[PDB]
Amino acid sequence: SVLTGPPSVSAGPGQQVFISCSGNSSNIGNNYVSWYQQLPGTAPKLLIYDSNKRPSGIPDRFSGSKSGTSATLGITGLQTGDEADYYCGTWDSSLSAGVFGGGTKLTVLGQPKAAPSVTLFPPSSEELQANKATLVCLISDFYPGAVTVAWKADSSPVKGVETTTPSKQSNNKYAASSYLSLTPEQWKSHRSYSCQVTHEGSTVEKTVAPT
């Protein structure tokens, strides 16, 4: 990295935010600057080129500026959809190469709490016929993005549990999943299995049974 900038930035909805990138005469000082937006799980998208111009389809809320050896992406009237990673880019005369800044994550303040939607699937008959059993606990649309998952077979099982870290969704909420690997004999030997999802002082438990 040859450009410097804030690793993360927050603001409220409706406000205006600045994202700065700093360099020197070999890059930002004497060359054109571009800005890119990257939403979760997608390729970057160009927002600003030639330091202050907007491609077609980029709303007027996004602006770009350059002073000295720093460039600035402005976002007036912040929206919940602006939540994203933002990257500045330019040409470096010393390197004779394009260069990127480290990136700035942008989070919009004041998002309401959302309880997780939990769906639990028992093993399918085809998997049982392959002599395996997997219980699948899918957790979506919760905010903030911190959850804990526990499993029960009437009592607490911890072996065979694999759970993902939460990942941001397109609507700015989070999702996670947990799997419980059993043998067919273990699955049929208990009255029920449960997935328990704890989020912000409340728990949601879903139960399945072989019968």
């Binding site: 040409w91 004779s96 769906t119 694999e162 999702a175 799997y179």
Partner: protein
């Protein structure tokens, strides 16, 4: 209508050569006025410029990678390619085919990014997934479970891409055995089960394998 299509995600063994080919549609790769290049991004990290060829003109390289990269163009097939040699696990990344317009020098702006393709540098062999249906039991959730594959990614569509409202394809879990699993679930009207067929299409390009599974009520 100018499109870029890469040769897809892949496994590369350590010390071997990472090869990525991008095919251009809707324009000729020889035409001046565009430049074509490569960018990479580690899965939770930042963007790194690799290099770019100005059509009709000069090729430019990240000085940190230049000594093990070759960027080339094949105009007959309207393609351009990246060779990254002597790879190690640090080279695991999303690799993007990229396009820019007008002059590259002093600008370097990318106005069109390809989809991005994960290249995983690992000495473990590829393994295609086993797919199991998650039967449904005013809406119903049904899905399929994609177990025990390597490397990432698996992509899942429903009904050959026709269905995507209510589709949620979850991030993969990395098992302690070093294989991945994921699930994809779609929420559909309950009244639709019995007349509407639901089929998940699970593409594991790294093993050149696709599995389609019809998911029916219990």
């Amino acid at each position: 209508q100018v499109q870029l299509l890469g040769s897809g995600p892949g496994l590369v063994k350590p010390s071997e050569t990472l090869s990525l080919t991008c095919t251009v549609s809707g324009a000729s790769i020889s035409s001046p006025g565009y430049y074509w290049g490569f960018i990479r991004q580690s899965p939770g990290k930042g963007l790194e410029w690799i290099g770019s060829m100005v059509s009709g003109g000069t090729t430019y390289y990240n000085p940190s990678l230049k000594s093990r990269v070759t960027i080339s163009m094949d105009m007959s097939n309207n393609q351009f390619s990246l060779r990254l040699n002597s790879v190690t696990a640090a080279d695991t990344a999303l690799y993007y085919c990229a396009r820019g317009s007008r002059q590259l020098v002093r600008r370097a702006t990318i106005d069109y990014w390809g989809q991005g393709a994960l290249f995983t540098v690992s000495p473990a062999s590829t393994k295609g997934p086993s797919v199991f249906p998650l039967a449904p039991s005013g809406t119903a959730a049904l899905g399929c479970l994609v177990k025990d594959y390597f490397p990432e990614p698996v992509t899942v569509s429903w009904n050959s891409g026709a269905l995507t409202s209510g589709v949620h394809t979850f991030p993969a879990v990395l098992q302690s055995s070093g294989l991945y699993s994921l699930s994809s679930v779609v929420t559909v009207p309950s009244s639709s089960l019995g007349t509407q067929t639901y089929i998940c299409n699970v593409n594991h390009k790294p093993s050149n394998t696709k599995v389609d599974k019809k998911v029916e009520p219990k």
